[PDB]
Amino acid sequence: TTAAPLLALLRENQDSVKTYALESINNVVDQLWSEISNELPDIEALYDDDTFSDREMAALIASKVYYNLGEYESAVKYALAAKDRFDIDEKSQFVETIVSKSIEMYVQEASKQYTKDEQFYTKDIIDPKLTSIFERMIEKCLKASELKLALGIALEGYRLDIIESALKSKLDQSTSENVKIINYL
Amino acid sequence: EQKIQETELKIRSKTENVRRLEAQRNAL
């Protein structure tokens, strides 16, 4: 209905309730994030509160708002924060957007990391969560099992790890294709 | 994904003032 009751709930005590708040809030964030958009500082403080567990809720909740705010690295960051509240196979366009929105961000980093190192991707510099989810989408791309899809990514993903493995794995010599899939890329 | 997709639309939309300046080069 309306989240002022939730904005009520926000600073109202009982992290239990606040748990409930977020949770409850989370389900209805979609409409009322607007109303909610103001409490994000608290929500941020919430996500800063390790004491209260779910605050990744708030983070992902904030992420949702941030989409509805257009804030994405915000959202992604707090999508990153969630990992739990978040899941890739949770399907919202928002998700699938921040899914995407995450994916991109990797590349440049990776590129900027490819800049310095060409094994950069072998290394930690990129948020693993990203890289994970990234590669987890690569997985999803591997599961897409048309890997040109994965390739052009991993092309820019610069991970021969991805590429070579996906190749060798998928190398069955699709006889000419595993030759050509190479050639294609 | 569709990330990659409508990225075009930018370029797609860009296409144009260009062609004005095209007319402009002419116009010059």
Binding site: T2, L9, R11, V17, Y20 | -
Partner: protein, 267 residues
């Protein structure tokens, strides 16, 4: 249950004690699903259980406001608001719900957020139907009339006479009084470079002028004997709002530069 505990506690005044009854009772209504307005029809909750859930809001709010808590009050009222107004909500309804928002508008009013104050009237489902029918609601409006443009004469009196000020409301009454006069202060400021420390006090409805004197000097008003002054009625200069809007050629030159870019971006 803890339900009546508070309900009795609150009923007893004693709201400081009533206070901590709420959080369990809070956790209740979540777990009771009642606190959240059930967007599926529960059949009976609103009047099954959620009755006092609707009231505990009121109850909790009334206490908090009685205790001069406001968020809590509003937080309750926030949560009341859907049971207060769902849209269709004839399902329950209650009375001090008026008083609450009345208080809470008067709160909002004292909170000095004008549009939201009025846009809440706008938000209000039935306005005049509700509004006029509530004196408590009828304060802020009539007040606002007084208030908004700045003559407070009866208003400042009105709330002193206000039965809700007389009932629970005095929380903002005093607040408002100041909040009133600060305007008048600026108004006097505006109206008067110089004013008798009398008149201003007379305007402030103060008894001691040292009451006034503080303010004016808190205001940092030039004051000689018997008279509030404004030698500078305003804040002029004071740092920012610069580099634009009074840059003589600079802007102009920027404007030149701009117009030269209207000449340059002319490509």
């Amino acid at each position: 249950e803890l339900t009546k505990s508070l309900s009795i506690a609150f009923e007893n005044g004693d709201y400081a004690a009533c206070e901590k009854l709420l959080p369990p009772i809070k956790i209740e209504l979540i777990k009771n699903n009642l606190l959240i307005p059930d967007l599926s029809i529960q059949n009976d909750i609103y009047l099954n259980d959620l009755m006092i859930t609707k009231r505990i809001l009121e109850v909790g709010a009334l206490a908090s406001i009685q205790t001069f808590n406001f968020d809590s009050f509003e937080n309750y009222f926030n949560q009341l608001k859907p049971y207060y107004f769902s849209n269709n909500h004839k399902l329950s309804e209650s009375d001090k719900k008026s008083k609450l928002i009345s208080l809470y508008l008067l709160n909002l009013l004292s909170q000095n957020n004008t549009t939201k104050f009025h846009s809440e009237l706008q938000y209000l489902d039935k306005h005049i139907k509700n509004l006029e029918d509530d004196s408590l609601l009828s304060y802020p409006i009539k007040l606002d009339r007084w208030l908004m443009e700045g003559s407070y004469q009866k208003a400042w009196d009105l709330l002193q006479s206000g039965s809700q000020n007389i009932s629970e409301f005095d929380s903002f009454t005093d607040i408002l009084k100041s909040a009133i006069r600060d305007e008048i202060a600026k108004n006097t400021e505006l109206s008067y470079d110089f004013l008798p420390l009398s008149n201003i006090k007379a305007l402030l409805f103060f008894n001691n002028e040292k009451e006034t004197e503080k303010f004016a000097l808190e205001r940092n008003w030039p004051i000689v004997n018997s008279k509030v002054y404004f030698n500078n009625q305003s804040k002029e200069k004071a740092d920012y709002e610069d580099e634009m809007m009074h840059e003589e050629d600079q802007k102009t030159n920027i404007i030149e530069k701009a117009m030269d870019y209207a000449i340059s971006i002319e490509n």
